Amino acid sequence: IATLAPEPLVEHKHRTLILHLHPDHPTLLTTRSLGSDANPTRQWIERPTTVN
Amino acid sequence: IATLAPEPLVEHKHRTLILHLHPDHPTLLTTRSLGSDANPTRQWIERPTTVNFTVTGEGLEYTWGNHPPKRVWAQ
Amino acid sequence: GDTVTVGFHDGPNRHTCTVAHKVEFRPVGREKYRHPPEHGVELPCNRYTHKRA
Amino acid sequence: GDTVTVGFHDGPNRHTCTVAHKVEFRPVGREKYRHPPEHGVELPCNRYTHKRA
Amino acid sequence: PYIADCPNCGHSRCDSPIAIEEVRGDAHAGVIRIQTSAMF
Amino acid sequence: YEHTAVMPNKVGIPYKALVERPGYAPVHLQIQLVNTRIIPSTNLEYITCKYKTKVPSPVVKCCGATQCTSKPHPDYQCQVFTGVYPFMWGGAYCFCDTENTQMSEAYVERSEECSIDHAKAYKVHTGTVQAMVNITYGSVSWRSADVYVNGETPAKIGDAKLIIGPLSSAWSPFDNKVVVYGHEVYNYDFPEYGTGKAGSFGDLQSRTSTSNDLYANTNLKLQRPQAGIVHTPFTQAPSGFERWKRDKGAPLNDVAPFGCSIALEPLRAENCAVGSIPISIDIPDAAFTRISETPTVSDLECKITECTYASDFGGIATVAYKSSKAGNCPIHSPSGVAVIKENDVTLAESGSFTFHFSTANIHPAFKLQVCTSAVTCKGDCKPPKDHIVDYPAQHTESFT
Amino acid sequence: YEHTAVMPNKVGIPYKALVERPGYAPVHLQIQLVNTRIIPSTNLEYITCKYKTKVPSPVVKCCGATQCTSKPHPDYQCQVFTGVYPFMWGGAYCFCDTENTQMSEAYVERSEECSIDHAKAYKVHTGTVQAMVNITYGSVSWRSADVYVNGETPAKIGDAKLIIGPLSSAWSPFDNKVVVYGHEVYNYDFPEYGTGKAGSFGDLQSRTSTSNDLYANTNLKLQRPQAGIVHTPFTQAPSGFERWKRDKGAPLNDVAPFGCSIALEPLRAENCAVGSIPISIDIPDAAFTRISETPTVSDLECKITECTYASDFGGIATVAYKSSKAGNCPIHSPSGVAVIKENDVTLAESGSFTFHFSTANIHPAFKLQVCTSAVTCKGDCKPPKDHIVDYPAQHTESFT
DSSP: OOOOOOOOEEEEETTEEEEEEOOSSOEEEEEOOOSSSOOOEEEEEOSOEEEO | OOOOOOOOEEEEETTEEEEEEOOSSOEEEEEOOOSSSOOOEEEEEOSOEEEEEEOOSSOEEEOOTTSOOEEEOOO | OOEEEEEOOOSSOOOEEEEEOOOOOOOSSSBOOSSOOSSSOOOOOOOOOSOOO | OOEEEEEOOOSSOOOEEEEEOOOOOOOSSSOOOSSOOSSSOOOOOOOOOSOOO | OOOOOOSSBTTBOOOOTTOEEEEEOOSSSSOOEEEESSOO | OOEEEEEEOOSSSOOOOEEOOTTBOOEEOOEEOOOOOOOOOOOEEEEEOOEEOOOOOOEEESSSOOOOOOOSSTTOEEEEEEOOOOBOSSSOOOSOSSSOEEEEEEOOEEOSGGGTSOEEEEEOOOOOOOBOOEEOOTTTOOOBOOBOOSTTOOOOSSSOEEEOOOOSOOOOSSOSEEEEETTEEEOOOOOOTTTOOTTSSOSEEESSSSOSOEEEOOOOEEOOOSTTBOOOOEEOOOOTTTTTSSSOOOOHHHHOSSSOEEOSSSOOEETOOOSEEEEEEEOOGGGOOBGGGSOOOOSOEEEEEEEEOSSSSOEEEEEEOOOSSOEEEEOOOSSTTOEESOSEEEEOTTOBOOEEEEOSSSSOOOBOOSSSOOOBOOOOEEOOSOOOSSOOSOOOOOOO | OOEEEEEEOOSSSOOOOEEOOTTBOOEEOOEEOOOOOOOOOOOEEEEEOOEEOOOOOOEEESSSOOOOOOOSSTTOEEEEEEOOOOBOSSSOOOSOSSSOEEEEEEOOEEOSGGGTSOEEEEEOOOOOOOBOOEEOOTTTOOOBOOBOOSTTOOOOSSSOEEEOOOOSOOOOSSOSEEEEETTEEEOOOOOOTTTOOTTSSOSEEESSSSOSOEEEOOOOEEOOOSTTBOOOOEEOOOOTTTTTSSSOOOOHHHHOSSSOEEOSSSOOEETOOOSEEEEEEEOOGGGOOBGGGSOOOOSOEEEEEEEEOSSSSOEEEEEEOOOSSOEEEEOOOSSTTOEESOSEEEEOTTOBOOEEEEOSSSSOOOBOOSSSOOOBOOOOEEOOSOOOSSOOSOOOOOOO
């Protein structure tokens, strides 16, 4: 029986995800821009943060 | 139990209300040309009087005593 | 816990034993909790059994 | 405490109950203590009563 | 005294009468108001 | 599809805009600003009302003086008097003849009418305007919701989310200083609490009705009673609340500009038709119909048949509808020249259906968008004869 | 003699002007604006607070579906679920295995803390500023009265009638939009009632505490309970009232400009020292002393003896008083260079009495008006050493 972080707040912009975000605990977020240019990102988020 | 003044005689003219008028007692008539130019009028009327009102395009309102306020399209 | 500290009570005496050992509990997942919740998704953790067989 | 963990003892059994809940105690004030002291100024905190009425 | 499903009741999810709902660590004074499903 | 729209502030008429969402079938609006009640920010500064010289009963010392003191009653006028011989039911009663002393005292007090029949001053700021906007939307056909004007407030009453204003026409018909009376509201430069000259408005100035303290410049001047008789000459200006009821000015619901009505209620100024409001709505996408389900109407023709160059929806025009399917078809003139009574027209397989409208230009060259099919309904119109009834649906006068 | 006077807005220091009535003896002022509490015009827009997901107890139909309906509770999230086997005290109890249905429902509700521990938005207008002005006047020696700023309001408390402002320094330290919390006031652009994004401030938005209706964008999303057990996964953002208490901004009583303090009280912003106030008083003529009764002091001499180029009244100066009678003599420097601690000096027959003062120019060439006798107290001053305590009495810095 395991973890789960509160859902994100998806916000639209022009080819851009603003994401007001607000976890319970430090959450490792990460992505993969699916181009052959990967351009991934990693950051533990414990403090609520609007990201892009 | 309260007042009421006899109804007016509405008469049309070109953007103008002639009103032959004939009260029972002194009646405070008044209006509001609804433009941002208010141009209101007040006059107690006890003597019967044919009056006039340059109504504008957008409208005027008309208050025959405590009889309810009327309104008028004069295009 | 920075340590581990064990002990029963025979009844006349406390008679415990204690030791150093670096302890943590990360749950498996990209969430770094400090403790398991009541809810959330299930996913493949590592864990010891209840049993003897 | 990261959690909350409750329990009495009927006498034959421990018979407890435990739960997740994020807990903190900031005192009201520009000081970020971890615990209320014996002294200091009084100022308008939020708090629950002792009573039932 | 209500009885509900405690989530990690020592071992795992039992049904304890003291099943904890509505934890409120929202005050300041070191205090939490709790509801057991048990009515002491 | 968040349909921004500048929109004229005018109360009693819908504004049937058209949602041009690229991809699905358009939907008409019907935005009727049923009210424009305002409710500026205000402050109760002081009630006034007519005084009542509720005289405390004078002292009569029979032989020698009775010095008066300045009691703290509002406008506590008190003046000792000698040289009396007060006839009270037995002829006089004090046996002296000049040492007979009479101390008259009178203070001002709120009338009993002050509680109920009372003018009421205010320092009036701008506040925030409101409306019970009906939209009989699309096929939703109903929502009558109370909204605001500040341009980030939604009101999710019904299914649609709608953001209004801020309006550009900041004319608060209320002035800064206002007096209020029952229902007749006067944008009057009331002098102030604490100052009002006696006889003038606000001779009595109480903060509220409960307020035991006040300001009573009434010029209350006691005079000596006459010829050895008990009474209290109080010489005083009848109130500036007595006048201000028969030498007053006229009410703002009878002298305001730009078309407002008034209430002694939250101090609104209803229905102030002036300027425009930049209104924007987020429709529920469920309410949309996809484009492939409404009939395509093109290869049509439009023409007036009896255009009335007027306010009431006298303008008419048949339209040779050339449909593909059969059903409904929302309509609108994106040009503001023509205002149409019908939001929606039913269609069989390529029939014809007249609608009603109103215009202001002799040659109405207005496009008509029959559910993604534009058409010029060019023609010519006729003036009417019969112009004395309430306000128009045309509201589109321009150069013609 | 209605002594008009421009006057700096600054709280904790008197302003001892001088009444130069032609004909009778002058009288000093001592005008100390003890407070500058503001109380702008405002509107309670919505309380917010942290939610409480006070889950109504889910339905469990044992064999077949239970369709949910959208009850009107605020943010009434409800989702039917199947495929359970709910362990409840006897193992499972519903004898089916997939037709076991579970309908979870959860709505948002104001916390119990919402009544008491709650942020509070406002649309803030300008309103009208106030003060408990003490004047220990003349020989009256006392009045501590609450006044206004609007430049026609008197306040006849004591014996003097005084008209204040309007001040020129219209900086309301409050912004238009403000959030308020207990005592810490935040000039925050709160999003609005009815809109606040979940997690962000104002996820819960209740008009007031009593208001059963609200706006709860909490992104409350129920999930199915696990492995055939009774419970209610509510997946939700902890409130934007939870944050806003530990990822907030700082308070306006800690970030404002031009020197203000704050209260959750009438929403004043006390003691805002900025600009000037055109103040004018009508003294009681009875309080005047006629000119022929105060000693004439001319043929005198003034000189500093130890001038301190400072804030505290360190500047001193003997004055070779050359009187005619003996008694009191009000004093003032009509030039604002020198601020004097003594309003009045006692005089024998042409003695000498030092007073205290403070200046800002190295060569203080300030006139001194000793009850209708001017004199230049020219000299030179010395800088101090010891500058860490509250605010000055000098407040006269200029080109030096």
